[PDB]
Ligand binder design. Structure first.
Ligand SMILES: Cn1[nH]c(=O)cc1Nc1ccccc1
Ligand SMILES: Cn1[nH]c(=O)cc1Nc1ccccc1
Length: 282
């Protein structure tokens, strides 16, 4: 079926939970043996969210190459994304090592450091120009260059220096700051505006390594971001845009990381975002 009318048909019939449970039943199951090794317990935020072995990002290190991060490679859309958990106190250095080694231009953050009165990820970037951060375990230096605070999101320019080689690179930090502590946004307008700002920066384009996207677990809000982007790109590429099937695209992405889209409300929000986004594109 088309999307907008499939949408109203699920609303009128109140069957979002049943649609979402079908997706969960059909989703791929692949091994995640490296994630579960005992030496990696303090590298995982949640015991039930792990990268598959076949698609995990490897750190360029011979001691321990593990990080909770997955490469989502979308062949028809010609887009790639790295989805990862919010960094932990003992993985901030690994996080920036990954950004460096994978040649990413941009980092997309969809959570606040504290939500619901608890810490959802480490304070992994500097908040003042004159107070830079040094990650001694991976030999990197990170400096805040500029910050632009808007009503729904903040964009930061950061400098990452590889202290071994003295090479430097400019990284863009795109921080969506207004996702509610509970539920999903009422309108997708600010989320779509944010997606378009990431696109306009070049961070999603083939001349760079894959964008790094995270929330707390790296599957819920993060899944919504890449699902909406890929679906809108496919609607631009194909002769028949009504052929794009958001459930099929989500199942394809779940071949590369488990659990993408965590609730039926996040599924409905993803439909809403693609529907409204397709009208603005034209
Ligand atoms: C929510 N909404 N409803 C409309 O009719 C338009 C939007 N917002 C929007 C913002 C940026 C890009 C695409 C859509
Ligand atoms: C909304 N949208 N997004 C694309 O990439 C292309 C379209 N157009 C469209 C044409 C007929 C039916 C539905 C959508």
């Amino acid at each position: 079926m088309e999307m907008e009318k499939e949408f109203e048909q699920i609303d009128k019939s109140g069957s979002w939970a049943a649609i979402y449970q079908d997706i969960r039943h059909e989703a791929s199951d692949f091994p995640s043996r490296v994630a579960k090794l005992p030496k990696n317990k303090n590298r995982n935020r949640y015991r039930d969210v792990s990268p598959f072995d076949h698609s995990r990002i490897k750190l360029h290190q011979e001691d321990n190459d593990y990080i909770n991060a997955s490469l989502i490679k979308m062949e028809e859309a010609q887009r790639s994304y790295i989805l990862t958990q919010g960094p932990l106190p003992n993985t901030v250095g690994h996080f920036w090592e990954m950004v460096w080694e994978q040649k990413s231009r941009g980092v997309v953050m969809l959570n606040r450091v504290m939500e619901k009165g608890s810490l959802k990820c480490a304070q992994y970037w500097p908040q003042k120009e004159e107070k830079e951060m040094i990650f001694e375990d991976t030999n990197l230096k990170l400096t805040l260059i500029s910050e632009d605070i808007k009503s729904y999101y903040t964009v930061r320019q950061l400098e990452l220096e590889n202290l071994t080689t003295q090479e430097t690179r400019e990284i863009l930090h795109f921080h969506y700051t207004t996702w509610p502590d509970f539920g999903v946004p009422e309108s997708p307008a600010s989320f779509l505006n944010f997606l378009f700002k990431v696109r306009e920066s070049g961070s999603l384009s083939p001349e760079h390594g894959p964008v790094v996207v995270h929330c707390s677990a790296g599957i819920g809000r993060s899944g919504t971001f890449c699902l909406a982007d890929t679906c809108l790109l496919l609607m631009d590429k194909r002769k028949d845009p009504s052929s794009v099937d958001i459930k099929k695209v989500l199942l394809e992405m779940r071949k590369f990381r488990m659990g993408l889209i965590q609730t039926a409300d996040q599924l409905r929000f993803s439909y809403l975002a693609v529907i409204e986004g397709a009208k603005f594109i034209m």
